[PDB]
């Protein structure tokens, strides 16, 4: 009815960063492009950490913790966003846990695209910009993490979605009836059908010139699933072989046999 308006408003209310805000900054923040500028950013933006010995541990481990905290914050926003999607609040709690557990990282990497351009990505609530080359320059496996996300973002951003489209796309990701271990599949599938239907209708008027946008976006959801499959393999490598990269407990829960 007004389903699409309710989802857009929940998105604007619950996410601190979005594409309009991001593009204002991406079109100034502090550019992090080597060890030195990374240290300057830390000294001014997180002064308490620099005076607690965080500059002792590796640059990769510091960036790791930055990204980890961002994902943790975003999972909280995504949970609050999901609670405001009409129907989600009525699902069983375990079904609600399943949907978030398998859905948040597809949503995060979808939304990550909004804070990226070809040269780097915004960090620290839009006050920092870490360069693509600098991430590429870190030691394995860290230099392997963001690069496929940049690749996804460049094509995803070429579709020229705005926040109203992205809000429906993310809602479709969360309300996914084929997540493993779902109980009330028939009702969640019905929720997705409604969301996907209003997304198709919204794309028809918001992007009247790209008549093929809707099936392109459907394929992007499949690409995100694969993207998260590959990303989880990087998480294991970190779990297995990195001493100072402790996984946040909330994230350990999400990644448990996914």
């Amino acid at each position: 009815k007004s389903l699409a308006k309710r989802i857009y408003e929940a998105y604007l209310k619950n996410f601190n960063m979005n594409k309009v805000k991001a593009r204002v900054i991406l079109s100034p923040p502090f550019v992090i492009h080597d060890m030195e500028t990374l240290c300057m950013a830390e000294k001014t933006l997180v002064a308490k950490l620099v005076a607690n010995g965080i500059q002792n541990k590796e640059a990769e481990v510091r960036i790791f913790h930055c990204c980890q905290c961002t994902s943790v914050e975003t999972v909280t926003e995504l949970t609050e966003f999901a609670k405001a999607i009409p129907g989600f609040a009525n699902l069983d709690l375990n079904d609600q846990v399943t949907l978030l557990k398998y859905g948040v990282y597809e949503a995060i990497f979808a939304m990550l695209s909004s804070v990226m351009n070809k040269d780097g990505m915004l960090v620290a609530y839009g006050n920092g910009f870490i360069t693509r080359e600098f991430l590429k320059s870190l030691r394995k496996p860290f230099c392997d993490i963001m690069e496929p996300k940049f690749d996804f973002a460049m094509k995803f951003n070429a579709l020229e979605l705005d926040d109203s489209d992205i809000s429906l796309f993310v809602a479709a990701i969360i309300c996914c009836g084929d997540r493993p271990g779902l109980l009330n599949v028939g009702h969640i599938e019905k929720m997705q059908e409604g969301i996907v239907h209003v997304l198709r209708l919204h794309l028809q008027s918001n992007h009247p010139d790209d008549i093929f946008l809707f099936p392109k976006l459907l394929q992007k959801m499949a690409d995100l699933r694969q993207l998260v499959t590959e990303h989880a393999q990087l998480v294991q490598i970190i779990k297995k072989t990195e001493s100072d990269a402790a996984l946040h407990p909330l994230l350990q829960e999400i990644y448990r046999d996914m």
């Binding site: 949970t79 846990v97 978030l100 407990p249 909330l250 829960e253």
Partner: peptide, 11 residues
Amino acid sequence: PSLLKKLLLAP
């Protein structure tokens, strides 16, 4: 127990 549950059950 589950941290995702606590997120979902919060005010």
